Amino acid sequence: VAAAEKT
Amino acid sequence: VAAAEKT
Amino acid sequence: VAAAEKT
Amino acid sequence: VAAAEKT
Amino acid sequence: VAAAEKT
Amino acid sequence: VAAAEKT
Amino acid sequence: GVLYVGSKTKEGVVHGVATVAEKTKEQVTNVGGAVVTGVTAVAQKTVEGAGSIAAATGFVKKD
Amino acid sequence: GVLYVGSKTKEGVVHGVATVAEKTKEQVTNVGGAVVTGVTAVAQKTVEGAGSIAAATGFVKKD
Amino acid sequence: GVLYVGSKTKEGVVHGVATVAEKTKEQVTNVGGAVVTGVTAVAQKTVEGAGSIAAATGFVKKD
Amino acid sequence: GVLYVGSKTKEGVVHGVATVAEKTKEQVTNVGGAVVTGVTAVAQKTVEGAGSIAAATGFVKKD
Amino acid sequence: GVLYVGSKTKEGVVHGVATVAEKTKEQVTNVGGAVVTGVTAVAQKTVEGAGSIAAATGFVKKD
Amino acid sequence: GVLYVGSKTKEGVVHGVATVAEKTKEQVTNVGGAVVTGVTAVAQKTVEGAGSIAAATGFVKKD
Amino acid sequence: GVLYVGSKTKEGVVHGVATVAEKTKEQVTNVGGAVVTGVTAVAQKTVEGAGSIAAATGFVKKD
Amino acid sequence: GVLYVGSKTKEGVVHGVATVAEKTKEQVTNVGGAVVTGVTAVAQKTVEGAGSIAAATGFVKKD
Amino acid sequence: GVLYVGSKTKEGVVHGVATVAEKTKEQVTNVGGAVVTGVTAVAQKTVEGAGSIAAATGFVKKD
Amino acid sequence: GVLYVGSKTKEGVVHGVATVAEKTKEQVTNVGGAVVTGVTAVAQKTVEGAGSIAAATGFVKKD
Amino acid sequence: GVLYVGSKTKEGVVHGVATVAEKTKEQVTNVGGAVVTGVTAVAQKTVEGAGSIAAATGFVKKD
Amino acid sequence: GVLYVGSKTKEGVVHGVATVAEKTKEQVTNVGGAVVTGVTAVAQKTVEGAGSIAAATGFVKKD
Amino acid sequence: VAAAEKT
Amino acid sequence: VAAAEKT
Amino acid sequence: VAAAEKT
Amino acid sequence: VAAAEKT
Amino acid sequence: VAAAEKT
Amino acid sequence: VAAAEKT
């Protein structure tokens, strides 16, 4: 599981 | 599982 | 499973 | 599990 | 488990 | 477990 | 009399390569796969085994 | 009389490489995978085994 | 009489490499994977074993 | 009479490398993986064993 | 008569490397993984064992 | 007559390296992992054992 | 309001040049004259005067 | 309002040139004259004066 | 308001040049003249005067 | 308001030059003249005067 | 308000030069003349006077 | 308000130079003339006077 | 005057 | 005057 | 006057 | 006057 | 006057 | 006057 949001 | 959103 | 949305 | 948000 | 937020 | 926030 | 066996060969050689790459902006975005870029001026020899340059496999699943 | 076996060879050789790269902005974003960049002027030999340069595999799953 | 076996060879050699890299901004972001960058002027030899340069695997899962 | 076996070889050699890198800003961000950068002017030989340069594995999980 | 076995070789050698790196700002941020940077002018030989340069593994988990 | 075995070799040698590094600001931040920087002009030989230069492992968990 | 006079110009600029010259044998023989060779990657500006690059005059005689 | 006079120009610029010259044997023989060779990637600007690149004159005689 | 006169210019600039010269044998023989070789990566500006790079005059005679 | 006169310029600048020269044998033979070799990475500015780089004159005779 | 005259300029600057020269044999033989070799990474400014780099004159005769 | 005259300039500067010179044999033989060799990493400024680097004159004769 | 014989 | 013989 | 003979 | 013989 | 014999 | 014999 991986996540990488740019906001 | 992977995710990578740019918002 | 992979996802890659640009918004 | 990893996470890396830029806000 | 890892986390790395820049805000 | 690791955490590394820049605020 | 002289015998040459497998001799004076060149096998897997690169020479005399000039390269210029002006690129204002490069972006790689990779999710869950493999990406290979820019492999330049590479030379290889194998004996008795498989040999790969810049090969990519997105994933291997064998459940 | 002279015998040469496997001799005077060049095997896996790189020479005389000039490279310039002006790049104002490089970005790599990698999630859960593999990225390989910029592999330049590489030389290899193997004997009795597989040889890989710039190979990438995104994941191996064998549950 | 002279015998040469496996002699005077060049095997896995790099020489005479000039490189310039002007890059105003480099960013690598890696989550949960492998990233390899910039491998330059590398030479290897192996005997009786697999040899890898700049190889990347994102993960290996064998639960 | 002379015998040469495995002699006068060059095996895994690098010489004569000039490199310049002007980079105004480098950033590496790594979460939970492996990053390898800048590997320059490297030479190796192995015998009877696997040999890796700049190899990266993001993780190994075997629960 | 003369016998040379395994003699006069060069094996794993680096010489004549010039390098310049102007970098206004370097940042590494590492969380829970491995980062390798800047490995320069490295030479190695092994016999009867695996040899690694600049290898990185993010973690090994075997619960 | 003369016998040379394993003799006059160079094995794992570095010489003639010039390096300059102008860096206005270096920062390393490491949480819970491994970071390796700046490994320069290193030479090694091993016999009968594995040899690692600049290897990094983020952690090893075997509960 | 803004005025730019003679501004933001590029005037006599060279950048991003890669050149390789493998030449097994160069000979110059000069008797009583001028020889110019190899002028590479040269940039000049003059103001209020004649400008010459790689100019050759074999002799000037004004008895 | 903005006025640009003579601004943002490029005047005498060269960029992005890659050149390779393999020449087994070069010979120059000069007797009593001028020879110019190899002028590569040259850029110039002049103001208020004559500009010459790679000009050659064998002799000037004005007795 | 802002005025720029002669400002932000580049005038006589060279950057990002990689050059390699493998030459097994160079010979210069000069009798009674001028020889110029190898002028590389040169940048100049003059004001109010003649400017010359790699200029050769075999002789000046004014008896 | 701001005034820039002759400001923020670059005038006679060289940066980021990598050069390699492998030359097995150099010979210069000079009799009664001038020889100039190898001028590399040179930058100059002059004001109110003539400026020369790598200029050669074989002789000046004014009896 | 701000005035800049002749300010923030770069005038005659060299930076970031890497050079390697492997030369098995150099010979200079000079009889009665001038020889200039190897001028590398030189920067100059003059004001109100002529400026010369690597200039050579074989002789000046004015009897 | 601020006035800058001739300020914040760089004028005749060299920095960040790496040089390596492997030369098995250097010979200079000079009879009756001038020889200049090896001038490296030199910076100069003059005001109100002629400035010379690596200038050679074989002789001056004025009987 | 100039001359250049190869013999 | 110049001369350059190869013999 | 200049000369350059090979003999 | 200059000379450069090979003999 | 100059001479430079190689023999 | 100069001379430079190699023999």
Numbering used by the authors:
A (entry chain j), B (entry chain g), C (entry chain e), D (entry chain l), E (entry chain n), F (entry chain p), ...: 16 to 22
G (entry chain E), H (entry chain G), I (entry chain J), J (entry chain L), K (entry chain N), L (entry chain P), ...: 36 to 98
The authors write:
Amyloid fibers of the protein α‐synuclein (αSyn) constitute the major content of pathological intraneuronal inclusions, Lewy bodies, found in dopaminergic neurons in PD patient brains. Amyloids are polymers of monomeric protein units non‐covalently assembled through β‐strands arranged perpendicularly to the fibril long axis, forming a cross‐β structure. We report that αSyn amyloids display catalytic activity toward ATP hydrolysis in vitro. First, WT αSyn type 1A amyloids bind and hydrolyze ATP in a specific lysine‐rich cavity positioned between the two protofilaments.
To investigate the interaction between WT αSyn and ATP at a molecular level, we turned to cryo‐EM and solved the structure of WT αSyn amyloids in the presence of ATP to a resolution of 3.08 Å. Interestingly, however, there is an extra density corresponding to the N‐terminus forming a β‐strand involving residues 16‐21. The ATP density is not fully resolved, and thus its exact orientation cannot be stated with certainty. The diffuse density rather indicates that ATP binds in several similar binding poses dynamically. The cavity in which ATP is found contains several lysine residues: Lys43, Lys45, Lys60, as well as Lys21 and Lys23 (predicting its position based on the partially resolved residue 22) in the additionally ordered β‐strand. The sole histidine in the polypeptide, His50, is also deep inside this cavity. The additional β‐strand in the N‐terminus of one protofilament interacts, in the same vertical layer of the dimeric amyloid structure, with the ordered core of the other protofilament, resulting in a peptide loop enclosing the protofilament interface cavity and adding a β‐sheet to the overall cross‐β structure. The following plausible mechanism of catalytic action emerges: With an induced fit mechanism, ATP binding to type 1A αSyn amyloids (anchoring at K43 and K45) recruits an additional β‐strand comprising residues 16‐22.
